[PDB]
Amino acid sequence: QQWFCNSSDAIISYSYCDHLKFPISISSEPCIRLRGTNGFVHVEFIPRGNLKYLYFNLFISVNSIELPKRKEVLCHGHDDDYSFCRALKGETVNTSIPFSFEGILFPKGHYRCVAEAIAGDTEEKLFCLNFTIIHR
Amino acid sequence: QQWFCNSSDAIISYSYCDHLKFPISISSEPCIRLRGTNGFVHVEFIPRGNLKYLYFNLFISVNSIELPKRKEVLCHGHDDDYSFCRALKGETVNTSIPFSFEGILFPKGHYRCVAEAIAGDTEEKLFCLNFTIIHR
Amino acid sequence: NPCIEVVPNITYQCMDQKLSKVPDDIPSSTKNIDLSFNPLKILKSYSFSNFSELQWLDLSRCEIETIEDKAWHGLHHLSNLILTGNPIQSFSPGSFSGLTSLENLVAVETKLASLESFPIGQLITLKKLNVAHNFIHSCKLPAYFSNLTNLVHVDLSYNYIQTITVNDLQFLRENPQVNLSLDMSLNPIDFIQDQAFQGIKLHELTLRGNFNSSNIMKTCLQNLAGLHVHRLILGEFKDERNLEIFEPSIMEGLCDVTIDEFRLTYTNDFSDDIVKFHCLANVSAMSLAGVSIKYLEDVPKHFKWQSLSIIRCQLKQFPTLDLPFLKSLTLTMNKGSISFKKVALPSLSYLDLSRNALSFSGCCSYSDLGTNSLRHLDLSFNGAIIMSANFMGLEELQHLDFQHSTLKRVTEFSAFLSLEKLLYLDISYTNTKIDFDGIFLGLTSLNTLKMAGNSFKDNTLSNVFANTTNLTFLDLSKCQLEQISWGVFDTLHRLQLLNMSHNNLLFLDSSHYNQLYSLSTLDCSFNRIETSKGILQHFPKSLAFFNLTNNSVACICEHQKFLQWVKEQKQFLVNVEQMTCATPVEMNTSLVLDF
Amino acid sequence: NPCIEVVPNITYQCMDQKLSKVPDDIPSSTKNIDLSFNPLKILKSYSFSNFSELQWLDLSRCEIETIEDKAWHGLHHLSNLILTGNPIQSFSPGSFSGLTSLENLVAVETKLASLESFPIGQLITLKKLNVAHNFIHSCKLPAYFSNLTNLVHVDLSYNYIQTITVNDLQFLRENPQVNLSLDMSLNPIDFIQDQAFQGIKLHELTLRGNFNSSNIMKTCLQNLAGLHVHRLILGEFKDERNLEIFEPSIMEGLCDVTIDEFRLTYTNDFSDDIVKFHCLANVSAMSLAGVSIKYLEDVPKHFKWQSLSIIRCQLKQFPTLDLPFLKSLTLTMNKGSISFKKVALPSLSYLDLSRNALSFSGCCSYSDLGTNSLRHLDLSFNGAIIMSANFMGLEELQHLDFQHSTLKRVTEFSAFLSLEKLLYLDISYTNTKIDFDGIFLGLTSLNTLKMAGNSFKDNTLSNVFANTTNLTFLDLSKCQLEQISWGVFDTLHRLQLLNMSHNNLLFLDSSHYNQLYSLSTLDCSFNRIETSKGILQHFPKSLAFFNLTNNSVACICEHQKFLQWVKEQKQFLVNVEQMTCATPVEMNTSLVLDF
Ligand SMILES: *[C@@H]1O[C@H](CO)[C@@H](O[C@@H]2O[C@H](CO)[C@@H](O)[C@H](O)[C@H]2NC(C)=O)[C@H](O)[C@H]1NC(C)=O
Numbered sequence A, B: 001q002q003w004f005c006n007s008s009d010a011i012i013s014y015s016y017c018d019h020l021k022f023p024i025s026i027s028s029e030p031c032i033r034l035r036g037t038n039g040f041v042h043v044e045f046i047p048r049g050n051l052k053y054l055y056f057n058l059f060i061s062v063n064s065i066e067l068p069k070r071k072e073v074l075c076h077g078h079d080d081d082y083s084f085c086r087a088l089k090g091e092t093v094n095t096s097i098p099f100s101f102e103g104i105l106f107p108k109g110h111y112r113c114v115a116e117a118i119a120g121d122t123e124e125k126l127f128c129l130n131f132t133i134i135h136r
Numbered sequence C, D: 001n002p003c004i005e006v007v008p009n010i011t012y013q014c015m016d017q018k019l020s021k022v023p024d025d026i027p028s029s030t031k032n033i034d035l036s037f038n039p040l041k042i043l044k045s046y047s048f049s050n051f052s053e054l055q056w057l058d059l060s061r062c063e064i065e066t067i068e069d070k071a072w073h074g075l076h077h078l079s080n081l082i083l084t085g086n087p088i089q090s091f092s093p094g095s096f097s098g099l100t101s102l103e104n105l106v107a108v109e110t111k112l113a114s115l116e117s118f119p120i121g122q123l124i125t126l127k128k129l130n131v132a133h134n135f136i137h138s139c140k141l142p143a144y145f146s147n148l149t150n151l152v153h154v155d156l157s158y159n160y161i162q163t164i165t166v167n168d169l170q171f172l173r174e175n176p177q178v179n180l181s182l183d184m185s186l187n188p189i190d191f192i193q194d195q196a197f198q199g200i201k202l203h204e205l206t207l208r209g210n211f212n213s214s215n216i217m218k219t220c221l222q223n224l225a226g227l228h229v230h231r232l233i234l235g236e237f238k239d240e241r242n243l244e245i246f247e248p249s250i251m252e253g254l255c256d257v258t259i260d261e262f263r264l265t266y267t268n269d270f271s272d273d274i275v276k277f278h279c280l281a282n283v284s285a286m287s288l289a290g291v292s293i294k295y296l297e298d299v300p301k302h303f304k305w306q307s308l309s310i311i312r313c314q315l316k317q318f319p320t321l322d323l324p325f326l327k328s329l330t331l332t333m334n335k336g337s338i339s340f341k342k343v344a345l346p347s348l349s350y351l352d353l354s355r356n357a358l359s360f361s362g363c364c365s366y367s368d369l370g371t372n373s374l375r376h377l378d379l380s381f382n383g384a385i386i387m388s389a390n391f392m393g394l395e396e397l398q399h400l401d402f403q404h405s406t407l408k409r410v411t412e413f414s415a416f417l418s419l420e421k422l423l424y425l426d427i428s429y430t431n432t433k434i435d436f437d438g439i440f441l442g443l444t445s446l447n448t449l450k451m452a453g454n455s456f457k458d459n460t461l462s463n464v465f466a467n468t469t470n471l472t473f474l475d476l477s478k479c480q481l482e483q484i485s486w487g488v489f490d491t492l493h494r495l496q497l498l499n500m501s502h503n504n505l506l507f508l509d510s511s512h513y514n515q516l517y518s519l520s521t522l523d524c525s526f527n528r529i530e531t532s533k534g535i536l537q538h539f540p541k542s543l544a545f546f547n548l549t550n551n552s553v554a555c556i557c558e559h560q561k562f563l564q565w566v567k568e569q570k571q572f573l574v575n576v577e578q579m580t581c582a583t584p585v586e587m588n589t590s591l592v593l594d595f
């Protein structure tokens, strides 16, 4: 319900989590095509942690078959590559990150991903998102 | 008793095995120095196997501490590098092989090595030698 | 307390409840209060009077819009005060008055306008100051800084600064003793008035994300002549506008600046020629963190680099180096799988190649690193080392570390045979079937072994610890041992910690350990013991800790002597409380037979 | 029989007993006799009369010095006759008379002198002939060869041949149909008379170890103009005198010889330029075996190589290739640790990189090998593969083999997702904790899985075999399973062999296997079973073999029904004989309760 885009071959949607509702606005340009894409992802929110040791826990599910759990490090403290690694709790963050991906084949079906952002220094959850992708 | 040489820092000797006494003459030039060497090894004998799949089983012992067992392949059938890989049982072999070694440190003491040559195709023992090296 | 206590009478986390004033029922003697996102709108006099023990206060995103005169009256030990987010546009005088030990003021995003109308003149203890994201327009340092003697960092990042002039940093000319650390990242600097920096000395200067024009950056950098900096940090950010063409000619101007440690962070387009620029020769400590370099082919030989760091930088091939002055090379967390190449570094004394997939096929030869003075080698978390020599020339090493690598061919001969003066070996989690009792020969000075995920032949602890007298810390955990051969440990007269958890021991013996005069900890839990054979009075009395948890001791009168000793000499055991038995009946602690 | 019998009434090994005549008591109907090193000194008429069944006779190092006329009289089925070592200087006529089916005569080191005074004219079945080490002086083939129609190999190695002349190989000019295979290694050839080879066609020609002068070799090779050979083998030997300088100009002369497959073996000094010589462009199948090459940098693009093999050759870097005609590249048993590099081989259809330490970091991308027609990939015994793609372009593969490599990141997504037509997968002994039930998704045509040293999560066989209907051979041995989840195997309607040995099963169930209509072998030994729960009549009757050995079945009336079924339907079980029980009393086979 929060946000959804229809690409050429994908339908992407997200909604808030259930045990955490901390606002965050996020979108992309253009709507991703699981057949390889290259574009930008826009973010806007107000942290509730220091964003200095920020990483993600991803719980993914393909056609109801849980993969293992993924952990993606985004900032690590020492001369990070992104400008927002230096925001503080209460400080408006508003940015656009570039990305590209290509070369993998994805099984058709229905995917789900629960992506929760953790402040690594204190182990608190900054937010939790409930994603839903349908590849056709 | 069979043959022995005194190098600058080594004393090398060999004798026949106990459950196999098949004649073979073998020597080296110059007497090896365990501090790295470069020279030739002269061989003369009359095989009792085909020498086409010839390898060695080495049982080594350092100051009475058995290492694991080594297996060294010398001929393997397909365009081997040595002229004697093509001898047959009953055919006089008489050759000289060049070798070099350098770069390793060897604990002083007393070593022993039982080196038995196996014809790989029929698993028969062409000969068995009882070596004895004293490093000083 | 309308808020959640973390610790009894301390650390009262009160974040994000609908409040409009600091609670009155919060006990004094508290030390850390957090009122964030609460909808306060004005601070009032004496409101914090009783908290004369508080030393960490946070007021972020509260909608503070004004402040009463004696707001922070009674605060006497407050060190850290945060104020991010509050739209306090004008700080009228006399604010920050009561505070008398503040050490770290954070005023990010408070719609500030200038650093002169900032009544902090008397805060004579302030260490840090952070006013990023604050509408400021001029780098001009105000005069009252002369009073803030112990100030060692100022952060002006993400402001509206546009130009630098000679009369700014005037304070720094007249005061050649202030040990200040500046920062101006993300300021659209376009005109550094000539002679701006002259006779100025900073301890650090960040300039990441300033310029987006090649010539603008060239000339601005050029105007820095005269500076004398201890750490100059350059680079860009991924999510911002940035240069599309970077050429070593931009580095011009830096050719007359006394840099002392030059760090170069991410850069969009990067040519390996940048680092080979004729006016880096005097830099003392190069560094690269995130730059997508490919080949570090060949640097001149008059460069005076005394250090070199490459962290998280992509690489496709081990660099080739001949610097006769470099020491302490470091290449970590590389983003590729490279194989080691022979180098010639006559002055190297510290090497670190961890966290890469460094497959190092030949090994431990002076021919691989022309240094007779190495002291710290580290190849942890790498791909596959292959031993082919026993450190013939590296006879000074004092710190070796092969963790998580696949260590191949180490059981086939006395490796480590030449490391006669080594203090810290570590071979944990390298799959190493110890099947040769000479594997640790020559380590006459070792003090710390660490093997955890390593097997043995027959699951029997062989006698591999002779001639290792000085061992003081020994960790055998997580091996899958099933019995301890007789005679081991019989000469470790100084071992003080002997970890053996998570093994599969069937029982315990006391004839072992009988010569461990100095032992003091004998963690032997999680290894499914039943009893302690042998006379139980030969343990060393120096044992202070003995884990016996997650065991399976059978208290079915099995060794009544042991079942009594376990509940008698328990002032040493760990968690004697929940010592369950495993033979019906369970849930017990004491056996009926005494003495 | 004064000698040791190997097989009853066959294969009477009689080597090295002090004999002076073939034993009389050796039974007829024997097939293989070995009289080697016995001190015979003369063969006598009819001595082998009764052995009219012998087909393999060996007389090596016997001190045979003459032969009677009717020596080999009664031998009618003898195929292989060896005569190495015996100093039979002159073979007077009428020898080899009685032999009428000899297929392989070996006369090495019999102090021969010439190939004309060799009375073999009538042996019209002789396939091979070996007269190496035999004093011969002239390559002249004798005329009577016209009679030996089915002769396809002659070995003149290690003789005294000195020169070749036009009237030798005359036979081969007049007879353009003989399919002969020559060999002249180790002959001090120094003068090949001009026009020697002209209109001559051999099927193979070895010349290893002939020359030790650069110019001599150059000119001699030059004189081969006109030849037409199917496999030319060159090189040297390590333990002999050999060229110290090898330059591509020696290859001159070969520039007008119709080579069809050029093999180049060990060479003392080797320059990578040799292979890039302008007159190899027409070779059809290059090959290198033992040459210490370093860089195979860049070969011209008009070369017509259709194959390329590099075996046991040292290498320091993956070669770079662009041959638009090469197919079936092979690089095996390399003597270094190299990492894969991207190549462009539009016609490749067979790749083999086994037994190296090929660490292949990126993976399964058409971008790595520009071939849309691969059919046989093989990366066994390599170092560490790292999956990063699902064969996006290699959709023709039919044979994949990842054995003993460290296969990393394969459980994190559906790898193999694009290999919709694959027949033989093999991932044994790649440490692979199967913890994802989509790992084998897409393999709709697989027929042969092979995973042996691979674990599972919880030691429980998950449901990972859906959408693998066509599986016909499945090997799960040597996993450390401890139970089989319910529902597995429920659609393998064609599995015919199901190996599960060496697991740690506690018992057996029969509700499983109930849908394996075609099963015929169910090796389930060495896995410590106690009984067979579930009704024991749902097994498929098509089971012909059932190992139940090294088990621990308890015959303490535990499941009397099973203890009866095991000794009743035993015409299928394997080695029902030694079926011990493991609950006192042991050493038994039958239980008292019948029916
Ligand atoms: C000057 O103040 C700075 C604080 O910024 C101090 O610099 C630190 O120095 C330590 C060791 O001396 C380094 O590990 C840090 O990297 C430095 N911090 C930064 C961010 O630069 C410095 O100690 C002070 N100098 C004096 C004389 O006190």
Ligand SMILES: *[C@@H]1O[C@H](CO)[C@@H](O[C@@H]2O[C@H](CO)[C@@H](O)[C@H](O)[C@H]2NC(C)=O)[C@H](O)[C@H]1NC(C)=O
Pocket (backbone or CB within 6 Å): C477, C478, C497, C499, C500, C501, C502, C521, C523
């Ligand atoms: C011995 O090493 C073991 C590793 O097996 C340590 O065990 C850990 O103990 C800590 C608490 O002490 C736990 O948080 C960990 O979960 C344990 N590790 C495992 C793998 O379970 C143990 O601490 C070490 N003993 C000593 C004396 O330091």
Ligand SMILES: *[C@@H]1O[C@H](CO)[C@@H](O[C@@H]2O[C@H](CO)[C@@H](O)[C@H](O)[C@H]2NC(C)=O)[C@H](O)[C@H]1NC(C)=O
Pocket (backbone or CB within 6 Å): C501, C521, C523, C525, C545, C546, C547, C574
């Ligand atoms: C067993 O008890 C010992 C002693 O209480 C634990 O040892 C402590 O472990 C922590 C974490 O490893 C260390 O930081 C301390 O230094 C250890 N203390 C001493 C002096 O030994 C041990 O971890 C416990 N083991 C398990 C597996 O529970």
Ligand SMILES: *[C@@H]1O[C@H](CO)[C@@H](O[C@@H]2O[C@H](CO)[C@@H](O)[C@H](O)[C@H]2NC(C)=O)[C@H](O)[C@H]1NC(C)=O
Pocket (backbone or CB within 6 Å): D152, D153, D179, D180, D181, D203, D204
């Ligand atoms: C000519 O005789 C030779 C025997 O030397 C045969 O050559 C073999 O051919 C097979 C397949 O055709 C190859 O696998 C072998 O490598 C060849 N042997 C050698 C040593 O060259 C050949 O088959 C015969 N040709 C005809 C027409 O029968």
Ligand SMILES: *[C@@H]1O[C@H](CO)[C@@H](O[C@@H]2O[C@H](CO)[C@@H](O)[C@H](O)[C@H]2NC(C)=O)[C@H](O)[C@H]1NC(C)=O
Pocket (backbone or CB within 6 Å): D477, D478, D497, D499, D500, D501, D502, D521, D523
């Ligand atoms: C199943 O695979 C196992 C490997 O564990 C095979 O077991 C071998 O059996 C042969 C004789 O059949 C023995 O010589 C080997 O020693 C066994 N291997 C081991 C590791 O012990 C077994 O043959 C296979 N079963 C089938 C049906 O082929």
Ligand SMILES: *[C@@H]1O[C@H](CO)[C@@H](O[C@@H]2O[C@H](CO)[C@@H](O)[C@H](O)[C@H]2NC(C)=O)[C@H](O)[C@H]1NC(C)=O
Pocket (backbone or CB within 6 Å): D501, D521, D523, D525, D545, D546, D547, D574
């Ligand atoms: C169990 O018995 C079976 C059947 O006799 C053995 O299977 C044979 O094993 C050999 C060697 O692996 C194969 O060459 C045969 O093809 C197998 N026969 C069939 C049709 O299964 C099996 O090896 C034995 N297993 C053990 C471990 O003893």
Ligand SMILES: *[C@@H]1O[C@H](CO)[C@@H](O)[C@H](O)[C@H]1NC(C)=O
Pocket (backbone or CB within 6 Å): A017, A018, A019, A114, A130
């Ligand atoms: C995500 O949403 C689904 C319904 O769309 C829900 O079942 C699931 O529990 C949600 N995930 C979390 C982590 O709450």
Ligand SMILES: *[C@@H]1O[C@H](CO)[C@@H](O)[C@H](O)[C@H]1NC(C)=O
Pocket (backbone or CB within 6 Å): A044, A094, A095, A096
């Ligand atoms: C966030 O930044 C973008 C430009 O990067 C700008 O267009 C947008 O207006 C900003 N957000 C708000 C709320 O103004």
Ligand SMILES: *[C@@H]1O[C@H](CO)[C@@H](O)[C@H](O)[C@H]1NC(C)=O
Pocket (backbone or CB within 6 Å): B017, B018, B019, B114, B130
């Ligand atoms: C080698 O000789 C020693 C005595 O020198 C003897 O004890 C040993 O058994 C011999 N080795 C073999 C394999 O016979």
Ligand SMILES: *[C@@H]1O[C@H](CO)[C@@H](O)[C@H](O)[C@H]1NC(C)=O
Pocket (backbone or CB within 6 Å): B044, B094, B095, B096
């Ligand atoms: C063996 O060959 C060498 C030369 O390689 C020769 O000197 C020696 O005489 C030969 N052996 C005999 C027994 O002649």
Ligand SMILES: *[C@@H]1O[C@H](CO)[C@@H](O)[C@H](O)[C@H]1NC(C)=O
Pocket (backbone or CB within 6 Å): C008, C009, C027
């Ligand atoms: C904190 O306050 C409570 C109640 O006033 C009191 O009982 C307690 O002793 C105080 N100190 C601590 C450490 O809890």
Ligand SMILES: *[C@@H]1O[C@H](CO)[C@@H](O)[C@H](O)[C@H]1NC(C)=O
Pocket (backbone or CB within 6 Å): C024, C046, C047, C048, C049, C050
């Ligand atoms: C301090 O405590 C006293 C008594 O506990 C109370 O009367 C007073 O109001 C408190 N101070 C403030 C500012 O609330």
Ligand SMILES: *[C@@H]1O[C@H](CO)[C@@H](O)[C@H](O)[C@H]1NC(C)=O
Pocket (backbone or CB within 6 Å): C121, C122, C143, C144, C145, C146, C147
């Ligand atoms: C420091 O503070 C005092 C306050 O008494 C003030 O008089 C003085 O001018 C300040 N220092 C400077 C340099 O202004």
Ligand SMILES: *[C@@H]1O[C@H](CO)[C@@H](O)[C@H](O)[C@H]1NC(C)=O
Pocket (backbone or CB within 6 Å): C212, C213, C241
């Ligand atoms: C740098 O960024 C500013 C802000 O958008 C822009 O006006 C200017 O044109 C940029 N510089 C260049 C060289 O494009």
Ligand SMILES: *[C@@H]1O[C@H](CO)[C@@H](O)[C@H](O)[C@H]1NC(C)=O
Pocket (backbone or CB within 6 Å): C255, C278, C279, C280, C281, C282
């Ligand atoms: C600084 O480097 C320059 C070359 O860029 C060199 O000429 C000069 O001597 C150096 N200054 C020193 C070594 O003090």
Ligand SMILES: *[C@@H]1O[C@H](CO)[C@@H](O)[C@H](O)[C@H]1NC(C)=O
Pocket (backbone or CB within 6 Å): C466, C467
């Ligand atoms: C090494 O140990 C052996 C016995 O295992 C001993 O003979 C030798 O003296 C030791 N080396 C020393 C103590 O340097």
Ligand SMILES: *[C@@H]1O[C@H](CO)[C@@H](O)[C@H](O)[C@H]1NC(C)=O
Pocket (backbone or CB within 6 Å): D008, D009, D027
């Ligand atoms: C071989 O000879 C023996 C004795 O003459 C005879 O008993 C036997 O049947 C013969 N055949 C075989 C196959 O042993």
